[PDB]
Structure formats: structure tokens, C-alpha cells
């Protein structure tokens, strides 16, 4: 088929990049990063090791508090406030790239992260009350 490679679809449309997410997901913790000798290269490599797991788990932490654990494409119950981006679907997924999309959605990325957070807290509270009978 195609298989562009790691970040190979960085310039492709959002919909086309949304079909090769495993390509980036698997390289978020591996690479080349057995004794711990504290030389100038050893201290350098140890930090490179702790830094990878740290950043990897911070993304999985947010993915957990949203109810999206172990997911690449999860859907939510947070509606799209058009003040975030009034662009239409066809001019988003068949037009923009993820890089320029993140550039314009950047202001509201912290707002959306809160709506996904409490929506998961209330949804799990709803599921518990439904299983109380």
C-alpha cells in the first residue's frame, strides 16, 4: 500500500493522517534510548530514558481521565462549541493538516481538556447508579 512512515503524513490532510496513528503511537517510547555508568554520555542517556516515559505517561494520564484508555480514536460527549472553530467538516478533514489545525485550536486546547475531564467523571457516576439495581 502506502506506508509513509513515522510522521510521514505530517503534511497530509487530517483525514488521511487519521488512518496511520499506530505509526506514531509505537515510536513514543522505543528507539535506542546495560549498566548505569554515570559518565557524560551515561548521565545524558539516563535523562533521555526517564524523559521518554515521563512524557509518554502524561499523555496516557489525560487519555485515562477522559475514558479513552488504550484508544487511538475515541468519541466523546462534549459538543463542538463553534467558537472554537467555525470551519465545516469537509474543509477540516479534506483540507487542513494536523499541524495547522493545532495552530488555530491552540487557545482552546485547555478549555476542551476540562470538558472531557468532568464529562468522564459524571459518566462513570451515571454508570454506577444504573448498575445499582
Amino acid at each position, epitope marked *: 500500500a502506502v506506508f509513509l512512515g513515522f510522521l510521514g503524513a505530517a503534511g497530509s*490532510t487530517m*483525514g488521511a493522517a487519521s488512518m496511520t496513528l499506530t505509526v506514531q503511537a509505537r515510536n513514543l517510547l522505543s528507539g535506542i534510548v546495560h549498566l548505569l555508568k554515570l559518565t557524560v554520555w551515561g548521565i545524558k542517556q539516563l535523562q533521555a530514558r526517564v524523559l521518554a516515559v515521563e512524557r509518554y505517561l502524561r499523555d496516557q494520564q489525560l487519555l485515562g481521565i477522559w475514558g479513552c484508555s488504550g484508544k487511538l480514536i475515541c468519541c466523546t460527549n462534549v459538543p463542538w462549541n463553534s467558537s472554537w472553530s467555525n470551519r465545516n467538516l469537509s*474543509e477540516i478533514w479534506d483540507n487542513m493538516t494536523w499541524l*495547522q489545525w493545532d495552530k488555530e485550536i491552540s487557545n482552546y486546547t485547555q478549555i476542551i481538556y476540562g470538558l472531557l475531564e468532568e464529562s468522564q467523571n459524571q459518566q462513570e457516576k451515571n454508570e454506577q447508579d444504573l448498575l445499582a439495581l
Partner: nanobody
Amino acid sequence: QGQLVQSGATTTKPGSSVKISCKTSGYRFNFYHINWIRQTAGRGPEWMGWISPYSGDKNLAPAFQDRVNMTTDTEVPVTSFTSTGAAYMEIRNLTSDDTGTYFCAKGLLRDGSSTWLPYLWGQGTLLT
């Protein structure tokens, strides 16, 4: 955004072959097709053809099959998502019945069903 400034509106006489330019700004010139449209007075507006500033692939109507040369030169990176481009248009067995206003319009989307659709147009040029 996006701008498409066209060439001058000078005139010639039958038998010749004129070149029409179209300079783009405010968008990545490679990401969208470039269409050529003709609005004659003695006919309905006609789609002449589009070309890919990225892949070089061109597609023109059979009425212009062996009479038109469509060319574009490579863009110039201005920013990460902005570039300047240029598209060219020529006619072969030219007469005076091809008189009218000529436009250049870029594609609509980068993918889907309406990819090459003329969406953002130029100011046009008057001919012979």
C-alpha cells in the same frame, strides 16, 4: 485568505499565441489545483482546464485538447503554510472568436469529491 493576481489585459490579432499569468499568495500554491476558465460573450462560460502545481498533472476539456499549454513553476516557501506561485496559459490555432474575459481559480479542497473545483478566482483579463 488567498490572492490570485492576473496578467495585463493587452490585445492581439488572430493567428498569434498569448501567455496569461496568475500569481498566488496567502496559501500553499502546491496544495490546490489551478483552473483556467473562459467567459466568452458569444457563448456560455467554459471550463478550459486545471493543472496540479504539486504533481504537474493537467486535465483540459476536449475542445481545448491540442490547442492549449498549461504550465506552472515551483512555489516559493514564505512561511510554513504560505507560498507564492505562478500559472501559465497558452493557445495554439488562435483566432478572434476566442475573445472574452479569462480567469484563474484555484481548487476547493485537497481531497474528497470536489478537489479541483474552482473556488477562489482572480480579477480577470480582457483580451482581443
